[PDB]
């Protein structure tokens, strides 16, 4: 029955106005996890490194609930990432706007669940000098919300180990370590948490 | 008689909600075939290789059926691929977003099958070391659904030989073999088949 799913897509998206973003009286939690795929290029004259990675993000929103037997037992479906609200997780030290390598399609579940895994190639600020030594380099780029504080979007990481099981075997760079650690920041001026997750990676040319 | 095809185009696309994507209950089978035209550029400083190929994708849908006698004996028609739902095959080791070299126009036949052959240029991960030996190098890319598992989209190749009868004679690298082998992969955690078609090409500079 495609009919049962078309009716549920219409009942969630057509005739209610789009969800207006997190508020402080209903905040939201986004969980990020990076599957790192390749260090494609390093540039010493500009100190920029280019990454190819899958960014899996997951959050949860009431406007997407339904119970499955009221639509003929369906509990998950896939939809364009444009059909739904997404968080604004952006790299803070990027230098060129990100290019997506993948389709942008989310899967959404009856509990209200959305998961979304875009592949992206990112240029970001990193000093590489010392990469062709046995020691290596370490780069850092943090991701986080650009307009919401911690009181409206909170971040969680499911693990602190970025998934390296899919790094390109014959790449031009080894990876020695790679972390997705959550960080919170206060300033004196202000009560609010400002929360981000820091991707730190240690890498070197391949002997 | 174009009145008859305007009438049929209007009745397939204006009347109905867009096909909401394949499900576990109503899955779908996509047939892929690659026609390889040129290895245009490799660079050893990033291990990226650039291919120009036509990928012929083909699938059948019940919602695109029509009876020719109810439409002046019409059997097939052309439509821009924006008028229809299209599958999610994607290169898994792409490094920059693909460049479309051709119009994106599909042809659909009265049984509801649609065929679509976009010309593309793709950059993907490949270490060229050894390209001006004679043993050549081998590169690989897998394509597959980016979101649908084997239970919702099946892949199938009608031949395992990538079509070279249109390869550029005077390119600067030349193909020794080129295969499109279908692969299934299961993992322990999970029942589902996850399927891909793996493109392997072995190539060398002009002897």
């Amino acid at each position: 029955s495609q009919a049962n799913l078309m009716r549920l897509k219409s009942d969630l998206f057509n005739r209610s106005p789009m969800y207006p973003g997190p508020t402080k009286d209903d905040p939201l939690t986004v969980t990020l996890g990076f599957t790192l795929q390749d260090i494609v290029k390093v540039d010493s004259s500009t100190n920029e490194v280019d990454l190819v990675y899958y960014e899996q993000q997951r959050w949860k929103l009431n406007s997407l609930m339904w119970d499955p037997n009221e639509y003929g037992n369906i509990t998950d479906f896939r939809t364009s990432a444009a059909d739904i609200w997404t968080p604004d997780i952006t790299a803070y030290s990027s230098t060129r706007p990100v290019q997506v390598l993948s389709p942008q399609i989310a899967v959404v579940t009856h509990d209200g669940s959305v998961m979304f895994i875009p592949a992206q190639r990112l240029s970001f600020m990193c000093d590489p000098t010392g990469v062709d030594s046995e020691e290596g380099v370490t780069c850092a780029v943090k991701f986080g919300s650009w307009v919401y504080s911690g009181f409206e979007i909170d971040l969680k990481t499911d693990t602190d180990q970025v998934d390296l099981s899919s790094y390109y075997a014959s790449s031009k760079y080894e990876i020695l370590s790679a972390t997705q650690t959550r960080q919170v920041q206060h300033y004196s001026c202000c009560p609010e948490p400002y929360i981000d997750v820091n991707l730190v990676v240690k890498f070197r040319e391949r002997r | 008689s174009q009145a008859n095809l305007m009438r049929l185009k209007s009745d397939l696309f204006n009347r109905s909600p867009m096909y909401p994507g394949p499900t576990k209950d109503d899955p779908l089978t996509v047939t892929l075939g690659f026609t390889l035209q040129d290895i245009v550029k490799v660079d050893s400083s990033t291990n990226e290789v650039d291919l120009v190929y036509y990928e012929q994708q083909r699938w059948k849908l019940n919602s695109l059926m029509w009876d020719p006698n109810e439409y002046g004996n019409i059997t097939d028609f052309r439509t821009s691929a924006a008028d229809i739902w299209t599958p999610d095959i994607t290169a898994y080791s792409s490094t920059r977003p693909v460049q479309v070299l051709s119009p994106q126009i599909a042809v659909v036949t009265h049984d509801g099958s649609v065929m679509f052959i976009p010309a593309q240029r793709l950059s993907f991960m490949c270490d060229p070391t050894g390209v001006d030996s004679e043993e050549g190098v081998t590169c690989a890319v897998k394509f597959g659904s980016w979101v649908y598992s084997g239970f919702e989209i099946d892949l199938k190749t009608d031949t395992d030989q990538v079509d070279l009868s249109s390869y550029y004679a005077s390119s600067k690298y030349e193909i020794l073999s080129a295969t499109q082998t279908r692969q299934v992969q299961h993992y322990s955690c999970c029942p589902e088949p996850y399927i891909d078609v793996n493109l392997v090409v072995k190539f060398r500079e002009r002897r």
């Binding site: 899958y54 989310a106 899967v107 895994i117 099981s165 | 980016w146 999970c190």
Partner: peptide
């Protein structure tokens, strides 16, 4: 090793 291939992670929030 499911959480490395995106078609797997989306079908199983249960794990990944």
């Amino acid at each position: 090793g499911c959480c490395s291939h995106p078609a797997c992670a989306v079908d199983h929030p249960e794990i990944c």
